[PDB]
């Protein structure tokens, strides 16, 4: 089935690979070569996870967990029953994700729109790769990556965090949080603005984008504008994720001590390092 205005857009062309071979739809889903690739990497990946469930001796969703090779195996291969499966599922995950991005690229071409969406998705892929590929390699062992399990992956977060004391003190982590909080502030403000203009006081007529600028200038003395806010939202989001990846890649590599201690540098600065009183003297 198609939306009332969809037919005129369903023309051929825009594919990156295979020409007209996979240029078709299944319901609302577009396929394309990368649509098949995604499906392939995905199916093979779930099978390995089911096979893993048997070997683990459980079928419960909250219990299934696929752990990476133990630190001992280094950056080498491990037996399926302990790390091997994780390694292959990771390859499958990477394959699925990259195929998804390219599928989006083909959909962009056919619709004649910019490539901003796939570009934004790639930051997500980057962050994932940072945790299961880049950090582990730099630390010399797959064992530092997180396990594929609903609850088990949460243990990993806590244990990795507390290994450096209170992870709050990670400077990059502080920056990443600020963007995550601000982005939510902006998402709330944007949704509220457009809606307040489209659904005015009962009985009144639709407000204009001018009313929107005025509202924000009356409230805080400035309005970034309708184009600016979408540029801002995209930016706050990618920054939150960029700094998140950064905050973890520096951890256990260039800095492996307690994060709180890192701040001593500021306190130890010559000109004030030796002055009685306060908190640090």
């Amino acid at each position: 089935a198609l939306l009332s205005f969809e037919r005129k857009y369903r023309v051929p062309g825009g594919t990156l690979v295979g020409g007209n071979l996979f240029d078709f739809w299944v319901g609302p889903f577009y396929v394309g070569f990368f649509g098949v690739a995604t499906f392939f990497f995905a199916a093979l990946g779930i099978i390995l996870i089911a096979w893993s469930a048997v070997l683990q001796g459980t079928w419960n969703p909250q219990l299934i967990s696929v752990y990476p090779p133990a630190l001992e195996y280094g950056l080498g291969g491990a037996p399926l029953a302990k790390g091997g499966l994780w390694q292959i599922i990771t390859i499958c995950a990477t394959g699925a994700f990259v195929s998804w991005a390219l599928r989006e690229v083909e959909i962009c071409r056919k619709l004649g729109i910019g490539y901003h969406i796939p570009f934004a998705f790639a930051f997500a892929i980057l962050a994932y790769l940072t945790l299961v590929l880049f950090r582990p390699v730099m630390m010399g062992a797959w064992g530092y990556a997180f396990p594929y399990g609903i609850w088990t992956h949460l243990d990993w977060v806590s244990n990795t965090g507390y290994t450096y004391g209170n992870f709050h003190y990670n400077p990059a982590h502080m920056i990443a949080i600020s963007f995550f909080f601000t982005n939510a502030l902006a998402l709330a403000l944007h949704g509220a603005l457009v809606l307040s203009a489209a659904n005015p006081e009962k009985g009144k007529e639709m407000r204009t984008p001018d009313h929107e600028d005025t509202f924000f200038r009356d409230l805080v003395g400035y309005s970034i504008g309708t184009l600016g806010i979408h540029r801002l939202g995209l930016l706050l989001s990618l920054s939150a994720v960029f700094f998140s990846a950064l905050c973890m890649i520096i951890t256990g590599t260039i800095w492996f001590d307690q994060w709180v201690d890192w701040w001593q540098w500021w306190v130890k600065l010559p000109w004030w390092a030796n002055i009685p009183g306060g908190i640090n003297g």
Partner: protein, 240 residues
């Protein structure tokens, strides 16, 4: 206890919310149709929402959604397979017929108005006080297409008064007539403006406007759709 009660209540509230949100997002494009235009058998678990009416500003009227959906224009396309789910090939010239990435929507043939009722977009030469305040001024630069041939020169910039933003460049072709080009599809450079979406021989095909001082919502779609369509359709002429 209270906690288990709260989380249980919350999950019910959430299901109701997702339901409410999906139905609200079905106010356009639905009911679903078959490729021939007749209503499709399977519409989904979500019922069409109860109509809402928008009171348009400036006495422009009213809009009620969901409502009777129709393209209000012919579509020059033909099927390429005996079963649904396959692409529909353009029967003529996709750029001229306005299909595929060259598609336009039959929006009202009136210009968008600002909060005060005046035209939102105007050529800079009619917008008293407006001037280029930063960056390279395009007025005067020749326009080059993806085939490396010059197709004309910029004779003005059409600005959005309310949001002080450049939206279109007015280009003059060899014949002395002008055409509008979307700002977001041109690269202003030190010695020229480059248009990758189109080749020189295609600039004359851009849809012309009625009045020399205003663009209507309908003409904006026809121009933007046409220039966007060049990326795919003017591709064989893109030697770079």
């Amino acid at each position: 206890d209270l906690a288990s009660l709260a989380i249980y209540s919350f999950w019910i509230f959430l299901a109701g919310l997702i339901y409410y949100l999906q139905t609200e997002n079905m106010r356009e494009g639905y009911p679903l149709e078959n490729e021939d235009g007749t209503p499709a058998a399977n519409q989904g678990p979500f019922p069409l929402p109860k109509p809402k009416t928008f009171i348009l500003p400036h006495g422009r009227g009213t809009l009620t959604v969901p409502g009777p959906e129709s393209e209000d224009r012919p579509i020059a396309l033909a099927r390429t397979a005996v079963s649904e789910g396959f692409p529909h090939a353009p029967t003529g010239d996709p750029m001229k017929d306005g299909v595929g990435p060259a598609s336009w929507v039959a929006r009202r043939d009136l210009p968008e108005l600002d909060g005060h009722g005046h035209n939102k977009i105007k050529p800079m030469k009619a917008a008293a006080g407006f001037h280029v305040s930063a960056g390279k001024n395009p007025i005067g630069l020749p326009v080059r297409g993806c085939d490396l041939e010059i197709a004309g020169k910029v004779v003005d910039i059409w600005v959005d008064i309310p949001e002080q933003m450049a939206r279109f460049l007015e280009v003059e072709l060899k014949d002395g007539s002008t055409r509008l080009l979307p700002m977001q599809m041109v690269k202003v450079q030190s010695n020229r403006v480059h248009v990758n979406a189109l080749s020189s021989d295609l600039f004359a095909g851009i849809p012309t406007i009625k009045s020399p001082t205003e663009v209507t919502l309908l003409e904006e779609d026809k121009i933007c759709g046409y220039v966007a369509g060049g990326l795919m359709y003017a591709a064989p002429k893109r030697k770079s």
